[PDB]
Amino acid sequence: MIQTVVKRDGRIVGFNEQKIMAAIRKAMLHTDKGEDTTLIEQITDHISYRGKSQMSVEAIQDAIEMELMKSARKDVAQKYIAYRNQRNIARKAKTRDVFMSIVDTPAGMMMKFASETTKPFVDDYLLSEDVRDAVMHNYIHIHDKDYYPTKSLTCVQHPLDVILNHGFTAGHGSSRPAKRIETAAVLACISLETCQNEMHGGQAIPAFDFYLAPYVRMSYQEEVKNLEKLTGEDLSNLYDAPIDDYIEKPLDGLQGRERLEQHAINKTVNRVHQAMEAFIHNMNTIHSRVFSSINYGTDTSAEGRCIMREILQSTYQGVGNGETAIFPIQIWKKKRGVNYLPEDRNYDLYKLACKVTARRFFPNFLNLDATFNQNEKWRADDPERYKWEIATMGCRTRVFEDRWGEKTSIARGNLSFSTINIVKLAIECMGIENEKQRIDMFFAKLDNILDITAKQLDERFQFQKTAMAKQFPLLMKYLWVGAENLKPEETIESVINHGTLGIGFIGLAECLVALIGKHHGESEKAQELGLKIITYMRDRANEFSEQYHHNYSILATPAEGLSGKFTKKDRKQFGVIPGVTDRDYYTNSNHVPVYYKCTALKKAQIEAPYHDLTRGGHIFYVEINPSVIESVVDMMDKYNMGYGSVN
Amino acid sequence: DTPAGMMMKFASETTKPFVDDYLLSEDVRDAVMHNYIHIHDKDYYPTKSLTCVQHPLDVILNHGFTAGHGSSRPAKRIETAAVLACISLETCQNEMHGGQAIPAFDFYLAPYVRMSYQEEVKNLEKLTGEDLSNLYDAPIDDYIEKPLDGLQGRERLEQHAINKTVNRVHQAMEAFIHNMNTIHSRQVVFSSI
Amino acid sequence: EDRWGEKTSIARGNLSFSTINIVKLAIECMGIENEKQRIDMFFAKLDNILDITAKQLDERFQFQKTAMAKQFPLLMKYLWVGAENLKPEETIESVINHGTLGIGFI
Amino acid sequence: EDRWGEKTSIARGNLSFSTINIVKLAIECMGIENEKQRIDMFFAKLDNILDITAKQLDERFQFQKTAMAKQFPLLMKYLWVGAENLKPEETIESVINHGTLGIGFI
Ligand SMILES: Nc1ncnc2c1ncn2[C@H]1C[C@H](O)[C@@H](COP(=O)(O)OP(=O)(O)OP(=O)(O)O)O1
Ligand SMILES: Nc1ncnc2c1ncn2[C@H]1C[C@H](O)[C@@H](COP(=O)(O)OP(=O)(O)OP(=O)(O)O)O1
Ligand SMILES: Nc1ncnc2c1ncn2[C@H]1C[C@H](O)[C@@H](COP(=O)(O)OP(=O)(O)OP(=O)(O)O)O1
Ligand SMILES: Nc1ncnc2c1ncn2[C@H]1C[C@H](O)[C@@H](COP(=O)(O)OP(=O)(O)OP(=O)(O)O)O1
Ligand SMILES: [Mg+2]
Ligand SMILES: [Mg+2]
User: Fold this and answer.
1) How far apart are CA A478 and CA A498, in angstroms?
2) Which residues of C touch A106 (CB under 8 A)?
3) B127 in contact with A at a CB cutoff of 8 Å?
4) How far apart are CA A377 and CA C1, in angstroms?
5) Is the beta carbon of B80 within 6 A of some atom in ligand 3?
């Protein structure tokens, strides 16, 4: 018969026939009709005989189920199997993640639960038939689909002046306008964190130096007032006294009323340094607990320069014990006539920026001299000229133009963006040996996929309106264009049509190899064909914008949540192809593949003429001494490069 | 109506049936269904979380903390200790499902009022060149602020430092309250002191 | 209080708690007409419900162990009682017992 | 070692210990012709004997507590770990779990 049973943990025990009987009985006492031991005895006798003298618990339960689903009582088997499976799932939850398979920080687990429970229901009940079929067959990717039922937007550029000047009331929390540098930075961090919860993208602050400039003078005035209180003097003429720069100088060797004109500047510099050092640590820890971007560089004043040189020296020492800071993402705004040439006003700040980018990976560089960035309403004497300087985010997104409004990049943002796979569009028509027919079929299918993605974006726009203003407290009261005439229970459809709808692509080297012998980085004809298809998409986007009364733009997708979710589903359907579906990850939107070795000059020369057709966003990533960064910035200046992120 | 609220509702509704059907016993489920017992925070059952903790602030103030990729040096004033306390209270809320409390607020924040008193004195020494080495550990009965209507020598150079220390602790005690109240927009963290 | 520690309210908290419905038991014990047998039946039901509640709390405690210290970064490195002698991959069994279990009523 | 205390060896000792006869279990498993079956039977009997021994040690532990500290003046006033916090009439339950239980073999 059977002598020994091995438990699950590993213990060895003697065979006990009164254990199978009591287990079958508890499955017979949960059905419509129970039974006495008439069949239990037969099952146990059959199991005990025909054994191996040593059996496991699972090896006995398998036999129990096999016997139960074989003798006239198939209703006890289906109660036995389900209970066994539930107990197995319960025991597998002590060291694994079974609950995610059925459908580490607790907040992350809850967010994953929400995303997984939301995605399929949106995929089924909200999308139309044609768009659903297009999405199913690995054609188009709808970014942040989990947040679809929450009629949410992507990002916005914060007009920090409103908050800093009038105060903000969000819920039961109200805050007055600031009066020094130790509160303006905190209020900026509060605004970023608050608006992050209301949108599924990043947060950016344009004109970082301009907004905080007025709060460097206030600290100086407070220090002067406190300095004249213990001496009984009268320093009323120093309040509006112009200052060349807030440079710290040693105090020894002076006396009188010119010695205390420097103590105030010294302590003002110290306070501004501490404030800018707290900003970085806060925006790093909050993310490590939020996509944050700050752009600055086009201010010429003693206060803006002080802020720009304190931030650029607190980002040099790093965080903690010298560690580099991942956030916030810092961007330098370079213009011809402000801080570029050696004789311009802020050349030393530019030199410091180039030095810091060689140790701490930041800042980036945004070129204001490009054709698509220049604005005609700019004059370097208006104190509010920052409204006409373009700003970008760390997520590679641009919103400058507008067909029914001003050409500004403040208080505007993205509404939605979707990505179109074109490598499959090339493999699906790789069979043809004649080039002309192959290209014609490629274009014919590209037209249809573009129409489908435009219809999907229009439908998502139609769903995103009908959202009450109260659902977004901070965004639709202080941080959007017309968000000052909207009642709490009023639809935002009267101001929603000021954002950007993005159409992106992933992979162009692969498409050309699946089309012609090589990619754009080796063959000129492939480069011409790629430029042609990009221009065709841009013209179709213009037609869509004219037809649907919206704004459409072409984007180079950042490839942060779509790096791999396009090539596995093509390997499983088309097989391994040399140089196309044999690398793991597709190459980026229009870059140069990381394996085709090139120099910076050739890469820049080939990749430059795409930025004029990628108005929705583009990057110039170069892998690698301040001289190297200076050369990179000069190379960007020589061409129409819009955004660069050399490290 | 806020997106975070909708996501949390989805997550809780997803979690509850799994807890009912896979993790509870048969006698517990019958009592739960027949309106006998109520299990608090059942939506957080799969996340093996705790409810409450009393924060020891001296550990994170004398030394620093390294959570994730961030780091922080030990506090050296009153305008950074009151911020590190907020950071700890907001960071530990996402790892539990209850409330956060700070015991002995006065004891924990006391050793930094004195450090604030020793920097204004240093600035005064740098301005009016003296030594002032005996003012550091002078036993102060109270940090009360009074007007400077008539003083001279080493008696108004010691009241001025007290005035500045009081003005710097007021602006941090109000910042603590404002920061803990404004977590509604950014459920608001349940905090006690 | 602590049966295996010191009377310290620092670095300690609650693990979980459940509440017990008392009024339903009293409504169930309402057809009795002796004023002395009714209270005895109420107590008999209350004892069983308390036993089930304690069993549920113990089972939740057993599940709450086997949790790695690395999914509670700040709590199990600085803020808990013995957190300092723990490693990221170790479970919190050795220090979890300083918390409390709660039985409620309404 | 200590699962609920520090890893010291001062003021700690042994509560009781019991020994298990292994040779008799092997003599009983001697008529089996197959070697692997013999070893499996030996382990099956050893597991049961270990369970009974642990039960006996736990029962003796339960009896050993509820002993007044007055019965061991010096030991429960100065020599034990948690002593000096105990009244003469208080039992030693709170400080008895720092000892060790012993299973032995020959
Ligand atoms: N001692 C045994 N002798 C024979 N078969 C056994 C024995 N123990 C378990 N089995 C087999 C046959 C039973 O139908 C089946 C159910 O096991 P069960 O008695 O619930 O044990 P278990 O390992 O789950 O223990 P527990 O639930 O008490 O921790 O396992
Ligand atoms: N309520 C029930 N309904 C149906 N079948 C049951 C029920 N209770 C027990 N059984 C059956 C299937 C089980 O595998 C067997 C023994 O029950 P049980 O000991 O609870 O299961 P188990 O061994 O899978 O659990 P565990 O892993 O928790 O020890 O009897
Ligand atoms: N808002 C904040 N969020 C997170 N960390 C912060 C914040 N503000 C300050 N910190 C950090 C910066 C330091 O690492 C630490 C202590 O600050 P602080 O007292 O200025 O120390 P320190 O030694 O760097 O000062 P200093 O060099 O200016 O004399 O707290
Ligand atoms: N961390 C914070 N979070 C939110 N609001 C804050 C925070 N810190 C300060 N505040 C609020 C408090 C005030 O309402 C507002 C401006 O503070 P502050 O610069 O001290 O000016 P004030 O109006 O209090 O001036 P004064 O104290 O001179 O009268 O910001
Ligand atoms: Mg510092
Ligand atoms: Mg104030």
Assistant:
1) 16
2) 71
3) yes
4) 72
5) yes
D52 vs A contacts (CB less than 8 Å): none
Owner of token pair 């059996």: A55
CB nearest to B10's CB, from A105, A118, A229 = A118
* Distance, CA of A299 to CA of A380 (rounded, Å): 10
Three-state secondary-structure class, residue B117: helix
Distance A174 CA to ligand 4 centre (A): 10
For residue D61, the 8-state DSSP code is H
> Ligand 4 mean position to B172 CA, how many Å?
9
> Which residues, other chains included, contact C44 with Cβ-Cβ below 8 Å and sequence gap of 6+?
none
Q: Is A55 in the pocket of ligand 1 (CB under 6 A)?
A: no
Chain centroid to CA B103? 10
Q: Which residues contact A584 (CB under 8 A, 6 or more apart)?
A: A564, A567
Specify burial of residue C88 (Cβ count, 10 A radius: 0-12, 13-18, 19+): exposed
Residues 6+ apart with CB under 8 A from B7: A110, A111, A114, A115, A118, A147, A150
Residue C100, SS3 per DSSP:
strand
Q: Which residues have beta carbons under 5 A from ligand 6 (an ion)?
A: B 171
In this structure, how many other beta carbons lie within 10 angstroms of the beta carbon of residue A223? 18
The full 3-state SS of A27-48, as one line of letters, equals HHCCCCCCCCHHHHHHHHHHHH
Residue D96's closest chain C neighbor by CA?
Answer: C4
B24 pocket-lining for ligand 3 (C-beta < 6 Å): no
CA distance A406 to A542: 19
Alpha carbon distance B165, B124 (integer Å): 13
Chains with ≥3 CB–CB distances under 8 Å to B: A, C
If you write DSSP's letter for every residue of C8-55 in order, what string do you get? Answer: --SS--EEEEEEE--HHHHHHTTS--SSSHHHHHHHHHHHHHHHHHHH
Measured CA to CA in angstroms, residue D99 lies from A616, B142, D80 at distances of 72, 52, 10
- Interchain pair A11, D41: CB under 8 A: no
- What distance in angstroms lies between residue B84's CA and the mean position of ligand 3's atoms? 9
Query: Strands A12-14, A4-6: parallel, antiparallel or unpaired by DSSP?
Result: antiparallel
The reported resolution of this PDB entry, expressed in Å, is 2.6
Q: Which residues of C touch A104 (CB under 8 A)?
A: 68, 70-71
Q: Which helix (H) or strand (E) holds A122?
A: helix A106-125
- Identify the three-state secondary structure at position D16: strand
- Way it was determined: cryo-EM
Cα distance between residue A639 and residue A641, in whole Å: 6
DSSP β-ladder status, B37-39 and A643-644: unpaired
Please state the atom number of ligand 2 nearest to the C-alpha of residue A91.
27
CA B27 → CA A93, A605, B189, distances in Å?
Answer: 21, 73, 35
Using the mean position of ligand 2's atoms as its centre, give its distance from the Cα of residue B39 in Å. Answer: 24
Q: Report the sign of the C-alpha dihedral through residues B83, B84, B85, B91, in that order.
A: positive
Atom number, ligand 4, closest to the C-alpha of residue B170 = 27
The residue among C20, C28, C39 whose CA lies nearest residue C106 is C20
